């Protein structure tokens, strides 16, 4: 019955995230130690002619970015655990996330380590200029 969703190789890290007190630190310590980052993300085909903002309702990737489905690059949606956000609503789910091209090795880790800018909505250090 039902329909399978995840690969077996990811089942080692997500289970860890399901049990730890701090899922973000658990994932970052797992990946930094040499563990394999999460695979099976929803990577979209884009014309690479977007505005380049971090989170958008539609794919908006420029030439130096790749667009992913937002629910796939969220650790809490992958592990199906409770979100730390206010009112429990994921800020990635239902939207599309632009990841820099030199960081497509680990999109989940990038989304855990970086936050978009309040004013311009670009990734801080990857397109945000508010100085």
């Amino acid at each position: 019955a039902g329909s399978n969703t995840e690969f077996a190789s990811n089942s080692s890290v997500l289970s860890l995230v399901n049990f730890t007190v701090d899922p973000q630190k658990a994932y970052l310590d797992f990946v930094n130690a040499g563990g394999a980052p999460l695979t099976n993300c929803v990577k979209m085909l884009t014309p690479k002619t977007g505005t380049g903002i971090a989170i958008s309702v539609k794919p908006e990737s420029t030439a130096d970015q790749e667009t992913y489905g937002g629910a796939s690059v969220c650790l809490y949606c992958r592990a199906h655990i409770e979100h730390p956000d206010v009112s429990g609503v994921c800020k990635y789910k239902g939207k599309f996330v632009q990841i820099p091209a030199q960081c497509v090795r680990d999109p989940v880790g990038f989304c855990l380590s970086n936050t978009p800018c309040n004013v311009c909505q670009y990734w801080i250090g990857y397109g945000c200029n508010c100085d």
């Binding site: 019955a1 039902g2 329909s3 399978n4 969703t5 995840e6 690969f7 077996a8 190789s9 089942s11 080692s12 890290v13 997500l14 289970s15 860890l16 399901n18 049990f19 730890t20 007190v21 701090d22 658990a26 310590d29 797992f30 130690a33 563990g35 695979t39 099976n40 993300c41 929803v42 990577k43 979209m44 085909l45 539609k58 794919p59 489905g69 937002g70 629910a71 796939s72 809490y76 949606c77 992958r78 199906h80 655990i81 409770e82 979100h83 429990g88 609503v89 994921c90 789910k93 239902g94 939207k95 599309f96």
Partner: protein, 505 residues
């Protein structure tokens, strides 16, 4: 890469997958969006939000190795060292029904302390804004075997209450035994899935109020505490897990347990399964095999306890050697041929099953050697034999008493842990049918350098008085004997013993 797993299975009854912005993985995307190069195209077809899909928690594998993070699925050899932490653990579950099909949620948790917790059916529901851990529709497993699970569908409690009840039970059980909790499971899959509901893991932590290792986590306070300071805490922190089936057992739990034990009979409930699992683990580790190199740290009064057993044994052996004019002693179970007393000169012989020195005979006792050993006394100090001979001095632990150094064991026996761990068979009053219980007494023969006692063999008591030195010695031996007797040891003697013969000297 290509092997799919049943973990996080979409248990919804929906006929189609999700949109790319809402689907958590590439596999769960509906095929209308996929292309040849494993990418997805944002089609103009509208999304079907809102939605609610039950997500399975069947398939957890805690095998990842991270520096600083402990190994929670321990081996046999580490589990033997953690034998004071052993808590049996069974879960009986309910099948998701109606809205969903394809996952099981916990219904009754049972522990080896004889405690059962009934929980409402709660599962993970994925929604278009995120995820919840909420109650879902469920059903008892069909068939006669699970007919007892039908009332439990109308008796469950909330998970945040059962979490705190579990933590409080574990604290009450393991406070004076260990800083750790080791769940001894039989089939660890569903047990680990249900343990995801009330356990947290992470790096090893210190208790917030003392120096002990932290064994529980408080989410409202975000703090860590040991078993003494865990009042109000709602999560178990860093438990160990043991799968007995992986130790080489064929068949189900009941036939494997009942092969070796006939004490844990009872109705089908999760606590009985947990007790049977822990009993089978004890039999596997301490009856089937013998380590003898693993030492355990002392807890309360082990050193003083062993000193008191030596004092009491010396006194009773000397008195039994003096009374009745016995000239020969067989000591069965002696590890290294160490005599107890020698002031009454008697012949000594030594036997054991696993001698540490070649001077000790290799022997098992089955009452057939009663005619072999009829010419002398037989000493059975902490030697477990189902039937003791006519003329003997026997000391045996009463396994019906449980303490810090005595844990429940297999087939009515008890695991006695003092430096080393010895499995003792069940105490049986019928084994001493040829013996009598020793009354209290004290025999002194050293020269003297207010108290009245009618059982104090003493030259002053022969003269109808008492001296300070013998009084102090008698009171000290009173403390020693009381500690020995309260710890669980009982003394048995040949029938013809009487302290009046000790008046001879």
């Amino acid at each position: 890469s290509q092997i799919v797993t049943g973990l996080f299975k979409d248990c919804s009854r929906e006929t189609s997958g999700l949109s790319p912005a809402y689907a958590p993985t590439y596999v769960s995307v509906d095929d209308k969006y996929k292309t040849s190069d494993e990418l997805c195209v944002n089609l103009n077809l509208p999304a079907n939000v809102p939605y609610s899909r039950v997500i399975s928690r069947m398939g957890f594998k805690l095998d990842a190795t991270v520096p600083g993070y402990p190994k929670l699925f321990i081996t046999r050899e580490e589990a033997v060292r953690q034998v004071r932490s052993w808590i049996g653990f069974d879960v009986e579950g309910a099948h998701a029904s109606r809205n969903a099909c394809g996952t099981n949620v916990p219904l009754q948790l049972g522990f080896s302390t004889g405690v059962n917790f009934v929980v409402q059916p709660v599962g993970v529901v994925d929604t278009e804004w995120g995820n919840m851990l909420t109650g879902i529709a469920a059903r008892p497993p069909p068939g006669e075997q699970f007919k007892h699970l039908v009332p439990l569908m109308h008796k469950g409690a909330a998970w945040p209450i059962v979490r705190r009840r579990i933590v409080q039970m574990l604290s009450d059980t393991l406070d004076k035994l260990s800083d750790y909790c080791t769940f001894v499971c039989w089939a660890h899959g569903f047990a680990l899935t249900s343990a995801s509901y009330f356990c947290k893991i992470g790096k090893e932590q210190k208790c917030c109020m003392c120096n002990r290792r932290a064994a529980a986590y408080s989410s409202p306070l975000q703090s860590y505490a040991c078993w003494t300071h865990s009042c109000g805490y709602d999560y178990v922190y860093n438990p160990f897990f043991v799968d007995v089936q992986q130790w080489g057992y064929v068949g189900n739990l009941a036939t494997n347990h009942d092969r070796y034990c006939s004490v844990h009979q009872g109705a089908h409930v999760a606590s009985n399964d947990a007790i049977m699992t822990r009993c089978l683990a004890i039999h596997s580790c301490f009856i089937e095999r013998v380590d003898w190199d693993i030492e355990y740290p002392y807890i309360s009064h082990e050193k003083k306890l062993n000193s008191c057993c030596r004092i009491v044994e010396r006194n009773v052996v000397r008195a039994a050697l003096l009374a009745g004019s016995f000239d020969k002693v067989y000591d069965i179970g002696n590890p290294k041929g160490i005599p107890i007393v020698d002031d009454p000169v008697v012949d000594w012989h030594y036997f054991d099953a696993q001698p540490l020195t070649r001077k000790v005979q290799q022997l098992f006792y089955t009452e057939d050697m009663a005619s072999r050993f009829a010419d002398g006394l037989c000493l059975f100090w902490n030697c477990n034999v189902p039937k003791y001979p006519n003329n003997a001095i026997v000391c045996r632990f009463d396994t019906r008493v449980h303490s810090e150094f005595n844990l429940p064991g297999c087939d009515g026996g008890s695991l006695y842990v003092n430096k080393h761990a010895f499995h003792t068979p069940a105490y049986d009053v019928s084994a001493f049918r040829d013996l009598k219980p020793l009354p209290f007494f004290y025999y002194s023969t050293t020269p003297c350098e207010p108290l009245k006692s009618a059982v104090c063999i003493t030259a002053c008591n022969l003269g109808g008085a008492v001296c300070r030195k013998h009084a102090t010695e008698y009171r000290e031996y009173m403390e020693a004997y009381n500690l020995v007797s309260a710890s669980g040891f009982r003394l048995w003697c040949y029938k013809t013993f009487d302290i009046y013969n000790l008046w001879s000297t």
